[PDB]
């Protein structure tokens, strides 16, 4: 609509439920008024994905390869109950898995900190950065139900023409169950290691990798060996210069060490662990609504910013019944600022870069000034002691943000 | 030596490193002096397992089936570095996986609480109980290294050999990587559900199950469907009477909800999640050294008690160097007490039951009186502010418990 700064090419991906509502408020009140964009939109709402048989999801991924920058809204991943809810043709796969599998790379997640917000974990005075391997494992697996007594096996047929190898997975003598198979590639694991070592060096913090190699001796063993190998041959000396270090730990030990630490380190996580632990860490610092998530591709030019949390169904349900909601929009806001910032970097656009940072400090300034959504208010007071007066609802908060942004930009221009 | 209370038949499993040292101190100073047990002993130390080609591990599991009660010390699970350390014949599999796979059931883990010990997580004023499915998944999988380009497929064959379903896992056309197969059985998942619903009813607390069914639609979907099914048909009404409830949550949502909760609920976890989260929860309340872990078998008669943590190798290295150490023995002691307490329940042995509870309160009384190992001292003071005078070394702590126990048992008679 009414815009002024030249933003450039950006790939936008619309989402579902509560986040879809918030997403539009962000563009209308915080972005469009000040930035003119060459926008490429792809509606990843559950209805449009079903309509296009999920083709829209693949088109978006490819669009990101071309334009180099994407910003995504949380989306719904269908299970049986969802198929029945929207009368879907199929139980579509996670659009995040599809995008990540096509782009590849590492998803770096970190909390968004405000000085007036108490944490649930007492010692985290420094930031914890998680590097989630964005490829393979459970997010590209094959699983099915075992109908009754029978044999389940997994085989490998070499392109080198030698004899195929067959391994027994299990002999179901009586009754059925379930089975599945998953995998990962060396090249992808290699990129994962490089991005981890590089992130630790740019921050000047130690690096940790977690696996369960004692149980999955071959599978996880490969992650552990590739990391150690690349470290010894290309990064060990650089780490020592900055007096930092790299260590591998069993997932058990790692989550406990993290819990009692004071933060200040990079945490390389396999796909699943990175998925689960980034939520635990976000909640630890305060709220799932306060965290950044950016997929950094192996090219060092392409990026996809997103909100790590989901569509927030519980809040949407309330909305549908006419009950007042107080959903944190910051995570969704920082997906735009982080993306536009990268856009700025790639175009040497100082104005856009200025805008991206300006919106980020306005978000933090607002909350520290005392205006926040219910989740952050519960951090200060106890959830049981939170009063309606301690916070603004979803839309009152977007309005306040809007005014503050308008004031800061004016302050800058004048 | 001495002994006085008739204890009955108990299967003991010796372990490795730091926990092996502690294990002997427990028998010599806390058990043997007051109880004469019919011990059917098995050495699960890494050296004896290698010597017997791991047969000793299977003999122990079978012994537990026969005598109905076992108590186990933490053990080492070999990876390449361990094979080189002890010059092992093979990279032996986890003895815990072997025992659990043979016995089946659910492993219930819970923290051991002391009033004077501060938590890392602020809101947990009530206990969190984890029910870890002890069968299948990653702990009975088939993983291998993929040497180069080729195809990996997984298949199922009815026992009547009439057909064969083949699913494509992945086409490796660029290089190599890894792949694996895993499974589970309906019957085992069914026992898991029943034990979870029953535990919630005996405690009078809500129950939660976590899975990632949105991604592993068939595999995790089966867990979710079996739980809901058994709930609706056999437990829903009983839950409502006690005003409690059951809900399924995505693993993402679950770990975050747990982090900000006040505790007071049963948490049904798939094998892997139960493995990882029980460590995070233990550290949250204070220390990995303060947690109980008991495998409750389907037969509702056989039980296996253990410590949830490992052999504590790091402390063990300082021990070998001839350096003074301070390692929490509490978890190892409760493995003996809960095991003896079950033996008492089965034989209707009142004297033994009194003894088991007496040792448990002595452990708690000692710490609350101000005598503890370094880990607990760091909970009170900050780790950076802990002084030697603030804690006892392992040998000093065991001796203090030993004297306190002597007192209580003397008053328990005189
Ligand atoms: N596209 C994605 O990246 C993504 C990621 C995760 C889940 N999902 C999808 O989202 C749907 C719901 O999944 P879920 O239940 O696990 O949801 P979720 O979106 O992660 O939210 C679960 C809970 O987290 C809290 N929360 C999350 N974001 C919040 C915010 N911005 N402000 C305040 N509180 C927030 C709320 O707790 P209270 O209810 O206690 O306030 C909410 O009920 C599913 O269809 C799922 O597939 C998508
Ligand atoms: N048999 C079992 O049930 C079991 C379970 C887990 C691991 N393991 C085995 O044990 C070995 C070591 O594995 P890991 O490194 O993950 O070890 P771990 O035994 O879990 O200990 C890891 C860290 O946890 C803390 N910790 C654990 N128990 C403690 C106690 N009793 N008192 C005080 N602090 C305690 C220590 O932290 P600080 O160093 O910071 O003090 C220690 O270095 C491996 O060979 C593994 O296969 C066996
Ligand atoms: Ca997540
Ligand atoms: Ca564990």
UniProtKB/Swiss-Prot annotation, chains A, B:
Catalytic activity: D-threo-isocitrate + NADP(+) = 2-oxoglutarate + CO2 + NADPH
Enzyme Commission number(s) of this protein: 1.1.1.42
Modified residues (N6-succinyllysine): 126, 400
Modification(s) after translation: Acetylation at Lys-374 dramatically reduces catalytic activity.
Cofactor: Mg(2+); Mn(2+)
Pfam families in UniProt: Iso_dh (PF00180)
Protein name per UniProt: Isocitrate dehydrogenase [NADP] cytoplasmic
UniProt keyword Transport, yes or no: no
Site (Critical for catalysis): residue numbering on this chain: 139, 212
Modification sites for Phosphoserine: 389
Superkingdom of the source species: Eukaryota
Lineage, opening ranks: Eukaryota, Metazoa, Chordata, Craniata, Vertebrata
Listed InterPro entries: IsoCit/isopropylmalate_DH_CS, Isocitrate_DH_NADP, IsoPropMal-DH-like_dom
Localization, UniProt: Cytoplasm, Cytosol; Peroxisome
Gene Ontology CC terms: cytoplasm; cytosol; extracellular exosome; extracellular region; ficolin-1-rich granule lumen; mitochondrion; peroxisomal matrix; peroxisome
Gene Ontology annotations of biological process type: 2-oxoglutarate metabolic process; female gonad development; glutathione metabolic process; glyoxylate cycle; isocitrate metabolic process; NADP metabolic process; NADPH regeneration; regulation of phospholipid biosynthetic process
Enzyme class: oxidoreductase
Cofactor note: Binds 1 Mg(2+) or Mn(2+) ion per subunit.
Disease entry from the Swiss-Prot or TrEMBL record: Glioma: Gliomas are benign or malignant central nervous system neoplasms derived from glial cells. They comprise astrocytomas and glioblastoma multiforme that are derived from astrocytes, oligodendrogliomas derived from oligodendrocytes and ependymomas derived from ependymocytes. Genetic variations are associated with cartilaginous tumors such as enchondroma or chondrosarcoma. Mutations of Arg-132 to Cys, Gly or His abolish the conversion of isocitrate to alpha-ketoglutarate. Instead, alpha-ketoglutarate is converted to R(-)-2-hydroxyglutarate.
Modified residues (N-acetylserine): 2
Binding-site list for Mn(2+): 252, 275, 279
Organism: Homo sapiens (Human)
Binding site for NADP(+): 75-77, 82, 260, 310-315, 328
Gene Ontology MF, one: NADP binding
